[model samples]
Target chain A: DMYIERAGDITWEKDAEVTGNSPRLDVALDESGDFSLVE
Target chain B: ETTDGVYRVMTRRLLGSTQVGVGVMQEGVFHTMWHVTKGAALRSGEGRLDPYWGDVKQDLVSYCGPWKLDAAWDGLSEVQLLAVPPGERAKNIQTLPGIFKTKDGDIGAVALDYPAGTSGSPILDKCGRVIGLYGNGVVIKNGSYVSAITQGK
Candidate 1:
């Protein structure tokens, strides 16, 4: 997942999570100003 | 009767030499034939031949050297020699070798060995002080002479 935010003159943020039987990871970006993910 | 003894001072510096002070005293007359450098004092003198003859004083004066006071004299000489008619030539010819301007504004005769066509101009200030003499001699073109101011005819 990915997140973006604007505060005053500057803004940028991101978060991501992933799960798998063998163990895995993932990352992504989105149009919304905020993002979240589960493990 | 000789009321006063006339002395002349003539400087012996060669025509092109760079000398300090008035080069020499010819008889009692002083001749300045060199440039007076900066910070150096120039000298002249006037002496009394008799106690009642009166006091004569020559003063050291300031002047700039490498001067061309003879420009007018040179021009005048050219005009006199080249511009005169044959008949009038004898009338305008300068009998004296050197032209002198006296302390009182009177011009006097100077005895000198000037070459043909040689021209000299007397330098004077507004106060009628004789500062120096300039001529159109070949060596004069390369240098100038400055001297102490003198009061004489």
Candidate 2:
């Protein structure tokens, strides 16, 4: 459910790695008020 | 305070007036209400009522409310535009005026115009009640989300 519908057609992709145990999910909006997620 | 009343044989006369109660459905911040009014033009001494207006939309979520007008030109006003991020500007849309009065009273209307190439963002008041939305960076009408108070959980 973390991923919601997009307002417009624009989309972007990025790559990153996580190194932790039992990581809690955190989602925030960016400066453009774009929604973001971290787990 | 109330007291019990004791009565013997008594006669009383009563007169009363009655009016029919009517209410319409309204949309909230995450909802939208369509075709709130009937007929193309409003008749004289008649008006529509909308309880919810100025809902907000952000990213994935959408909000809206019911909007009514006494007449097309009663509450209309000029649109106000603002800049976002950098120097990007949006085109403005004209708004009609009038209020959403349920009873036979004059309410008022706000500008419902939006800027071109951009739609409005849903807005809510500090109390979380939907007030209006932003269209193309312009504040159209009174409903707008309280950006300063909203925080994602």
Candidate 3:
């Protein structure tokens, strides 16, 4: 089982591969720590 | 736009919550967990953003947790992305702010004040690229594991 310790550590084993569309986008972080979407 | 691809799916129940699959809409179909979308209804989204799945599964499993949790863990983190360091922050679709952390990288942890019905919220990188869904949390550690969004079939 995937195990996560309270000490901020994560450990897991490998498995079969799966494929599909998981989109990604871009954004701009402003001086005020605000983020705007970038085309 | 990033908002264009983000979505939320509603479910009946699971893990004590209504299983709100807060994710993104890929190619017009809302992408959430099968467990979350088993009997879920589309709550949001339109058009799409091009998300390139990362081939960081093995790295994630190695860095995140043990894969003995069955395919559920594998299936979960696969569609999730890994967020690294140097500007390690996370944002929700609504642009909510939070802190992200990782031991080595790949599957890391998110620190946020989770609201009700906010499960499966997509965690984004600095560029607003979705890394993965907000998985589980360690209350003692004040952090939550981010499920990596790699690929699917």
Candidate 4:
């Protein structure tokens, strides 16, 4: 099971992979306050 | 705390309050999604003005919550797009926004305007894991209907 937390900003376990999709268009965090996305 | 339980999504340069369609998960990230087509219109909301908004394609913001919520928290580049019968999919579709939080914490969610909507809603697997999102991308008041999808490479 993937364990997710709501502890301010996002922090997940290193091996918590899920069986899902390649959501290529959305954004993700690179640094604490910075985000990056693919076109 | 926000007047409402939820908060709006924004950027440092954008200065917050992007309530049109935004969501957050407490996982050290905040992400709001919209149709890729409106990339230009969203940029104008920021005062800097992107002369190349259409030319460029990145509106990601430092951006999630929730747990029973069995979504694929895997990397976006890791899995294949979802496929299922329209009738089966119809069983899970809901127009109301679903809160993505569970005992684990809060993850973000984008409820589709319709089950077949192109961008926002997520498609689920039999095990209840999200196999794909409707549109990487919304809508007329008639609710929503799906037309396109992204099966990542």
Best-performing candidate as measured by TM-score: 3
For this target, which candidate reaches the highest lDDT against the unseen true structure? 3
**Candidate 2's C-alpha lDDT?**
0.22
RMSD of 3: 18.0
Of models 2 and 4, which has the larger TM-score?
4
Q: Return the lDDT, model 3, position A15.
A: 33
lDDT of 3 by residue, B1-153 (tens): 222354434333444324343444433333333333332233223422222322122211111111211121222333322221112222322222222223332223333344534444554444434455554333322243223332233
Per-residue accuracy of model 4 over B1-153 as CA lDDT, tens digit each? 211111222222333322233222223222223332233222322222221211112232221211112355332232222222222331233222222322323333333333332222234433434433443332213433222222111
Each prediction's total of clashing residue pairs, residues at least 3 apart in sequence or on different chains, is 12, 26, 23, 26
Q: Retained native contacts per candidate, as fractions?
A: 0.00, 0.01, 0.00, 0.00
What is the Cα-based TM-score of model 3?
0.35
Interface RMSD of 2: 27.7
- Candidate order by lDDT, highest to lowest? 3, 4, 2, 1
Residue B105, model 3: Cα distance from true site in angstroms: 7.9
Q: TM-score for each prediction? A: 0.18, 0.20, 0.35, 0.26
lDDT of 2 by residue, B49-139 (tens): 2223332223122222324211122122322211111113222222222232322233222333322212222222222222333321212
Minimal lDDT window, size 10, model 2 chain B: B1-10
| RMSD per model, one decimal | 44.3, 24.7, 18.0, 15.6
